[PDB]
Write an enzyme that holds these catalytic residues in place. Structure first.
Site, mmCIF file in Angstrom:
data_model
loop_
_atom_site.group_PDB
_atom_site.id
_atom_site.type_symbol
_atom_site.label_atom_id
_atom_site.label_comp_id
_atom_site.label_asym_id
_atom_site.label_seq_id
_atom_site.Cartn_x
_atom_site.Cartn_y
_atom_site.Cartn_z
ATOM 1 N N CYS A 105 0.833 -1.233 0.000
ATOM 2 C CA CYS A 105 0.000 0.000 0.000
ATOM 3 C C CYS A 105 0.863 1.278 0.000
ATOM 4 O O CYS A 105 1.337 1.702 -1.093
ATOM 5 C CB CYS A 105 -0.985 -0.063 1.199
ATOM 6 S SG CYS A 105 -2.303 1.201 1.107
ATOM 7 N N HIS A 125 -0.454 1.484 -3.461
ATOM 8 C CA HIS A 125 -1.840 1.958 -3.533
ATOM 9 C C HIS A 125 -1.908 3.040 -4.580
ATOM 10 O O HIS A 125 -0.990 3.853 -4.705
ATOM 11 C CB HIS A 125 -2.232 2.565 -2.203
ATOM 12 C CG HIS A 125 -3.695 2.773 -2.065
ATOM 13 N ND1 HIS A 125 -4.297 3.903 -2.529
ATOM 14 C CD2 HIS A 125 -4.663 1.976 -1.579
ATOM 15 C CE1 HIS A 125 -5.616 3.829 -2.293
ATOM 16 N NE2 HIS A 125 -5.880 2.636 -1.755
HETATM 17 C C1 LIG Z 1 -1.959 2.202 2.438
HETATM 18 N N1 LIG Z 1 -1.233 1.888 3.429
HETATM 19 N N2 LIG Z 1 -2.145 3.554 2.248
HETATM 20 C C2 LIG Z 1 -2.085 4.505 3.395
HETATM 21 C C3 LIG Z 1 -3.155 5.560 3.035
HETATM 22 C C4 LIG Z 1 -3.117 5.592 1.475
HETATM 23 C C5 LIG Z 1 -1.984 6.474 0.973
HETATM 24 O O1 LIG Z 1 -1.036 6.024 0.327
HETATM 25 N N3 LIG Z 1 -2.066 7.795 1.309
HETATM 26 C C6 LIG Z 1 -1.111 8.746 1.012
HETATM 27 N N4 LIG Z 1 -1.223 10.009 1.353
HETATM 28 C C7 LIG Z 1 -0.099 10.723 0.972
HETATM 29 C C8 LIG Z 1 0.847 10.003 0.310
HETATM 30 S S1 LIG Z 1 0.358 8.339 0.192
HETATM 31 C C9 LIG Z 1 2.115 10.507 -0.300
HETATM 32 N N5 LIG Z 1 2.427 11.815 0.262
HETATM 33 C C10 LIG Z 1 3.730 12.067 0.462
HETATM 34 O O2 LIG Z 1 4.508 11.188 0.846
HETATM 35 C C11 LIG Z 1 4.262 13.533 0.128
HETATM 36 N N6 LIG Z 1 5.384 13.790 1.048
HETATM 37 N N7 LIG Z 1 6.155 12.470 1.377
HETATM 38 N N8 LIG Z 1 5.835 11.682 2.532
HETATM 39 C C12 LIG Z 1 1.313 12.757 0.496
HETATM 40 C C13 LIG Z 1 0.169 12.156 1.336
HETATM 41 C C14 LIG Z 1 -2.955 4.102 1.141
#
Ligand SMILES: *C(=N)N1CC[C@@H](C(=O)Nc2nc3c(s2)CN(C(=O)CN[NH2+]N)CC3)C1
Length: 187
Positions: A105, A125
């Site tokens: 995910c 994901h």
């Molecule tokens: C499965 N485990 N997952 C967790 C929730 C969903 C998911 O991937 N949600 C995300 N929200 C963000 C993501 S991934 C990537 N993101 C960043 O990483 C930007 N800065 N780096 N950490 C923004 C929020 C499925």
């Protein structure tokens, strides 16, 4: 003797993506160590389920090597794995020893953070795809489970049984994976 898995449990981990692999691996006769990133104290997961680790990561990483290192997801859990020097060293070693790494995910974004398995076909994901593909260090897959040599990735809670059974097949073979699958009542 038994194969051995290390599951790294960080605050904010997705509890289903943690417990499904742990339970399905144990059903296969795999010795699983649930290792707390922050120590042996209980860990608050993404939906506030609290899981008590078997050991700290500091202790469990001294009891290696492991046949598989497992990274659950969870937005905060994956962020915590991605920021850990300790996780970087364990993944680097595992890669160097041609050991299986499995991430589900959001979990695969910690591979990006620690520069692990660059050039692999991976899935994540859908919501983690832009993060994972930032800098074009992997090839993206829409497969529910993607296994490119020793990098095994999956997409969400609903692919967790498939992900866990793919780990079992990789470590213990098709027959053990079929024996563990049989009473699960999967569709
Ligand atoms: C499965 N485990 N997952 C967790 C929730 C969903 C998911 O991937 N949600 C995300 N929200 C963000 C993501 S991934 C990537 N993101 C960043 O990483 C930007 N800065 N780096 N950490 C923004 C929020 C499925």
């Amino acid at each position: 003797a038994s194969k051995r898995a290390l599951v790294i449990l960080a605050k904010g981990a997705e509890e289903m993506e943690t417990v499904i692999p742990v339970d399905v691996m144990r059903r296969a006769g795999i010795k699983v160590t649930v290792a707390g990133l922050a120590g042996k104290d209980p860990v608050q997961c993404s939906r506030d389920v609290v899981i008590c680790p078997d050991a700290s990561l500091e202790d469990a990483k001294k009891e290696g090597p492991y046949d598989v290192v497992v990274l659950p997801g969870g937005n905060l859990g994956a962020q915590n794995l991605s920021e850990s020097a300790a996780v970087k060293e364990i993944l680097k070693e595992q890669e160097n020893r041609k050991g299986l790494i499995a991430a589900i995910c959001a979990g695969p974004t910690a591979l990006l953070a620690h520069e692990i398995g660059f050039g692999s076909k991976v899935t994540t994901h859908p919501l983690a795809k832009d993060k994972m593909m930032n800098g074009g260090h992997y090839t993206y897959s829409e497969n529910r489970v993607e296994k490119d040599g020793l990098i095994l990735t999956s997409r969400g809670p609903g692919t967790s049984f498939e992900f866990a059974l793919a780990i079992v097949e990789a470590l213990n073979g098709k027959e053990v994976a079929a024996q563990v699958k049989a009473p699960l009542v999967l569709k």
